[PDB]
Every structure is written in C-alpha cells, then in structure tokens.
Amino acid sequence: ELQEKLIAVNRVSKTVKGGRIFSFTALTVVGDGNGRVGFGYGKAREVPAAIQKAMEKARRNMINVALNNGTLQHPVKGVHTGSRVFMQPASEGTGIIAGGAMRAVLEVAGVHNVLAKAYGSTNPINVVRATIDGLENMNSPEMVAAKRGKSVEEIL
Amino acid sequence: GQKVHPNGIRLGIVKPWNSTWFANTKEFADNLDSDFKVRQYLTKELAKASVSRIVIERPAKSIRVTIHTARPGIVIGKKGEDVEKLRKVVADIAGVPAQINIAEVRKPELDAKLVADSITSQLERRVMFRRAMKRAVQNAMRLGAKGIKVEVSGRLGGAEIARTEWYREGRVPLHTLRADIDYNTSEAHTTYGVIGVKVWIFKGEILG
C-alpha cells in the first residue's frame, strides 16, 4: 500500500592500495498516497542490494504532511544545502508540474496539483531533502487556528 | 596460482581417493589409462544423468565402478537395462570383467560437482550469471551447508573484458585441514568463450 519509487542510482568509488573499489548508491522515496512521506538512501556493493537498503530505511522515519484536497495549502519554500525549492498549491487537475527528483517525492506524497521550481543545485539527494523539509513545515488551517487561538472561520 | 586444490590437500585426512586400487609399476600406468577412459566414457554417456563422483576400484583383476548420481532412475532405466548396457562397454575398455554399483546422492544441492554443472547448464542456455550464482548459494545454505563459496570467471555476458566474481555465505575455512570442503569445478562453453565455475561447500569439521 506504500508505493515506492527509486529516484536515481549512482556509482561511487573508493581508492585503496589495490586500486579502485566501486560501490552503488540508491535514492528511494516511499509514500502512502497521503501525508506519510519518507525517503531513503542506501549503499552496497551491488545495485539490487542498494535499493533494498534504501527501501528499508525509507519505510521508517516517515513524515506527516497536512495536505489539502489533492494539492498543497500555501506556497512554501524549502532549502537544504544546495537547493532552495519553491512549490505552490495549484488548481484542480493541472498535474504534478515538478522537476526530476522533486516529481518522485511529490507523487508518493499523494499530491496531484503542484507548481514547482527547483532553484540552486539540483542534486537529487539534497533536493529531495529540501521538499521534505518544505512539506513538513507547511501548516494547515487547523494548525494555525489552534496556534493563534482562533477559529478556522476567523482566519478564512 | 595462489590457492592449493582443496581436494588434493585433504586426501590423507578427510577425503577419500576416487580410485582405491593397487598395482606395481609394471601395471600401474595401464590401469591409470584404464581408469581415465571409463571416466571419459561415462561422463560423455551419463551427461543428462546428474553424476557427481565416479569411484573406480579393481580387486583380483576385475574393475568395480561406483557411480554417484542424483537420480539412479535415468542411470538404470528398466531393471538391468542401461546399467547392463554400460557394464559391457566398461569390460571392453578395461579388458577385465566389470561391475557397476550405484550409490544415490542424497541432497544434490549439497554436492559441488552437481552444483557446478547446474550453474554451467544454466549459463549454457544464456541466463544471467549473477542470478545463477545467487540461487546456487541460497539453495545450499537452506539445505544445511555450513558455508558455500561459488565463483565464475571470465567473459560474463559476452563482455570483452573478462572478469571473475564470487559469492560467499557462511564460513568456508580453506586452511583448516579437517574441514569438509567439497570442491569441484565445471566449464561452460558459451558462444563468447569459456566460463569456468568453481564451487566450495563446507559441511563441517570431521573430528577424527
């Protein structure tokens, strides 16, 4: 029931006395089609072993996102280390308008109507951190009502 | 050429010889040719049979060939049909009266010659070599081997740069002399070349 997407696989290296040792890294993100989103980053000597370590860590450390109907709730920004990221709630049925690694994380997030733009470095590890950081501090009309101590209707 | 052959180093300790007979120097090398020709013939003839270890023994100028196989049904056929066919051609080759005994191989996933030939048969019909090495290791550790190491070598998937790969699960102590390392080796004659397969299987330590 948790849909699983790998974003990018990558071969890294490590030089020792014998020569170059190669290894593989895998960046996967999971989600339930609702606010539960979580990503993972695994690494092993082999590509099917690396995605499995990535899927394992992604299933725990999930994060909860207060969605709207099928879209976001207010235009929120998220940064991580190279990637200031803008994303925006959008009208019904405009699709996921998002780039690369950001497309995979919002699709398992269960949103369906976004207007996104990834500024800065578009390295897939940091931009998937920047959207999760961007989606986590997005707050609901309920959350701002309990915080400010008003009703939802006084906020409109 | 770093590693000693694990069968040949254990032959006085935990492994038996595949030929246990005696002759003087006058009649030695003729027997060793005679042992070679029947292992040549039976391997070509019982290729579809999953034969592992052909043990040859000759008392009183009469050869006794003990065939180890995973299924004796294809070796026998009808009751005295193919064994009797194979017994009369051994006597033509050995020049002495022959006798064929069949010792059944319980658990064929825990026998190195059967496992190496299973990898070779899979590689010959063009399967992914890494998938073949996983299933050879998973079946043996499930069936109860204390440790298996398999290894293929050279021209894998038709790549022009030949390399070797090996998997290992469980402990395979090669330097331990009392270790029951079942070792044997096969060769796959693919369309891109020859792929050599080695497989070590550790059953446990004989405490003699």
Next chain:
Amino acid sequence: TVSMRDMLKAGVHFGHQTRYWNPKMKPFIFGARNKVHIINLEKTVPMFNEALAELNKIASRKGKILFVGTKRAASEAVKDAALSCDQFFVNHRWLGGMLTNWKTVRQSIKRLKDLETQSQDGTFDKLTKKEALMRTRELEKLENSLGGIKDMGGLPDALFVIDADHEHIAIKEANNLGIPVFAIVDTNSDPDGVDFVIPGNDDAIRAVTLYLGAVAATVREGRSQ
C-alpha cells in the same frame, strides 16, 4: 511521594560547579553557593511526582522498565533496585546500539544463555582447560554487560537513566525508537533529550538510593494494580 526535606537531607539540591553548567538548566537552578549551583527543589518535587505517576501508569499495563546507570559508584545500587521490582538494569557500559541494533545484541543474549546453560547446568567439565576458562571469561563478560537484560526479550517501554549526559548514548537510542525517557538531569546535563525531566544531583550516593527506591516502590505498587 517524596518530601522536600527527604531531598534536602540526601543532597538532591547539590550539583556541580559554575564552570560546568548547561544554560538550558536555567529554569531549574535556584542559586549558587560556594561556587556550586543549587537545584530549585520547588520545581523538583512536582515534576518528580509527575514522573512517578507515569511509572505507575506504564507499569500498570505491564510495561518493561530499564534502569541505566554506569557511574562506577552507583553501579551496585542500580542493580539492587532493579532486582527489588525484578526489572532490568545496565550497571556496566551501555553498548552502542543496545536498543537500535537490538537484533545483533539479541544474538548475544542467546549466547549468554547457552554459556550459562553449558557450564552451570550442562556441567561441561573435562574439556581443554584453557578453553574451559575461555568459556568462563566469556560468560563472565557477557553477564557483566548483558546479564541485566537477559530476560527482557523485546524493547523496553520506559527508560530510567541516572545521568542525562554520562548515558547520552542511551538517550539517543531511546529518542529514535519513541521510548519515553526518565533521567536525573543535573546542571551539567542536557534537558532536551529527556521526555520527563527530573532535576537532581548525580554523584550523591544517598540521592541515588533516594531516587531508585521511589521508583522501586511505584513499580511494585504499579505491578499489583
């Protein structure tokens, strides 16, 4: 359940000097006498009694409790308190990943049982006597580390810590697993990783016996209910 002059006689208000204190402990320090901070016992009592209520809440539904202190002065006291209310203790060094990497330590819990089975119960004398001492010092080492949790089987449900910075590894493993944390948070410690913060001294042997007996009561009182 513990009055203020109980705390005042044992030495709960004592702490460490003014060159070791954490600025996060500002709502808990009363003053500073003889270049040593003084813990505000006005806020110690209603928070420690709020913590013992949750112990009575969690041990009601048969939760597992782990006592964590390896100060090598309060090592025997944290063992005797855990054997009163027959709960679990860590008196020698908290292994890195004892909670998060439980599935590897589990493979040493089983080893601890088999070494206790083979030598004591199995009576496996007359082996190679240097290995017979290697079996002995293996079982001695594993009991010294994992003997306090050898009957626990699963993750505990609440964690009681003697020092919030000396046992900071156990705080982080509990923070990952969502397990609530009970700790004597002194002035030189960090009060953020502890879910129910209890101010108080850490080096006072009288206070250690004072802290644990109030816990060893409310577990036994919580067990029968």
Next chain:
RNA sequence: UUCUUCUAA
C-alpha cells in the same frame, strides 16, 4: 655536501 629527468591509451 651535492644528487637531475622519464614519452604511449
């Protein structure tokens, strides 16, 4: 005490 340099894929 002095103690330089090494192309090809």
Next chain:
RNA sequence: CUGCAUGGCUGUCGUCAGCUCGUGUUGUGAAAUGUUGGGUUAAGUCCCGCAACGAGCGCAACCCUUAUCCUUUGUUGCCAG
C-alpha cells in the same frame, strides 16, 4: 595468429598481517566508525578501554616429518643372556 577475447594453471608483492561485510550510529555526500587508543604478541595475537555490537577471509591450531618414552608384532631385521 591473437594470453590485449578466455578457461585452467603459475610467478609475484608475501607466510606480509592484513582484507572485508551485516546491522547500528555519525556526515547533505564521497565516506567514517568497527579495524582506532592503552598494553602485548610471530600475528587484526590476546587483554582492557571505546558507538559500536557481531561475523567472514586470513594468523594460530587440526596435517606430515624430526626429537624421548610405552605397548603390540619379531623376518628377509636384532645378539644381551
């Protein structure tokens, strides 16, 4: 003919004490930790310490030979009585 398409086999660094993995943790990451430190050893040998806990390949032992004794069997070997 091509060892620069290969299998097999071999030299070599080097009988040098190293080389790695699982899970955990640290780092955005390449990676790190483990494997470092205090001692000690022929040895990642062992002990203690330690965010590591474990495991594997090796380092050792199991093998052969030699060095003393015992029992058994004494010819084609032996000669004290």
Next chain:
RNA sequence: AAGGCGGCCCCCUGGACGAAGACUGACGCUCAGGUGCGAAAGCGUGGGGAGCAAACAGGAUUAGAUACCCUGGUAGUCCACGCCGUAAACGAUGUCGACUUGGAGGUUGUGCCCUUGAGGCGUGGCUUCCGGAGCUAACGCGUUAAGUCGACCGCCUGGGGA
C-alpha cells in the same frame, strides 16, 4: 583610522576611557566625485655612512651553478626636504546601529563588603581562547557573527588572452 609605534629625560600635541553630575536638543549615519594619510623598495637635492647588504668580484659546489655555501663588497639601509602611492596594505571579513544561550582568561578603570590578606560582591572599556542555537558547499563562524535585521557605499559575472 590604517600604515605603524619599543632605552631614558624634557618641550609641544592628538585620541580613548571611567566616575558622578551639569548642558545643548536629532545637531545623526553613510558617501560617487574630491581631499588627506599611506610599509618596504625606488627617485631627486644635500648630508651621513659603524654594521648589514642587492649589484659586482674571488673561492667552492656541480655535468653546468650567471644559485644556495664562503670571503669581500657598492648603491641602499640612517638624517633633512620633496616625489612615488604600491604590498598576502590580511581578520584575504566596508562602515554605523539594534537584538540573540554560555565558559575560561588578559588588560584597564570604577562602586560596594569588616581590605578582619594578595580577598568578597558588583558595574564599564578593550582584548584572547573554546563553544550552543543559528548559519555555511564544507572548513568553520559563533554577542568582537560568517547568527537575526536596518541604512549607505565599494565590488563580482567561466578559465585564459590580461
């Protein structure tokens, strides 16, 4: 203010800071162009010239040695007055103001406690080291910010070519 400043004494002289008051009443901040200052080396004129020392000479060293090493040695270094206006002129961090957890110091005032000792309790200036949040590509920075903001200025736009 920066460059920079080191025996001692006098004369002339700038700035900072502190303690209490008194007073003026926004008089402030920044600054293109402009002007001034600005290490050493160098230049001009006039002195001075112990030591040091480019250049140069000799000796070694070396395959060579226009070098390092040695023995010498001239501008120069010093003073007066001009000029040059540059340095890795660096904290590689423009100035001014506000706010934001701490620790160990150095230095320099000043209040208080019986100075019952060089102590005890404070309160200002300047400064060094470590470090939290936060920030940062990381290294690190971290109340003297590279944190959170405001005002103004200078500057950047691939590496060469330059």
Next chain:
RNA sequence: GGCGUAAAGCGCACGCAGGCGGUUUGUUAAGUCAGAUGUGAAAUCCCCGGGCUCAACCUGGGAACUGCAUCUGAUACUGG
C-alpha cells in the same frame, strides 16, 4: 543572486552633492489611499456569443488598455 577561503570589500580615513534618519504634538496634503469625471483611436489579446458543413477565419457585446490629467475626499505612514 552574491563578495572569509570558489569571480568579488577600495590600504585607511575625512567629507561636499546624494541616499537615509530617534521621539511628541499641531498643521499641511506633496507622496500615498479612495471615489468620480475626461482620456487612454480602431483592430489585436481575453471573456460570452454569432456566422461560414467544422476549424483557420469573419463578427456582436463586454472586459482590458495596469497610464495620465482634473476634481472631491481620507490622514495612518512618508515628506513639508
């Protein structure tokens, strides 16, 4: 968007023009804000329609033309 180390803080400072400016009251209405009027050609673009067998195209009505001027206000902020 940047400028410790990747390109990037003038060597430092004074300072004219310029930019900016604590706090309180009054006044002004310049900025600002609101309304109205005049204008912002038509076409084009957009919206709702209509017409060519549909579409391209043609076309009716509207919105828009984010501007400027004048007048009537508003006085928190900025200016005087």
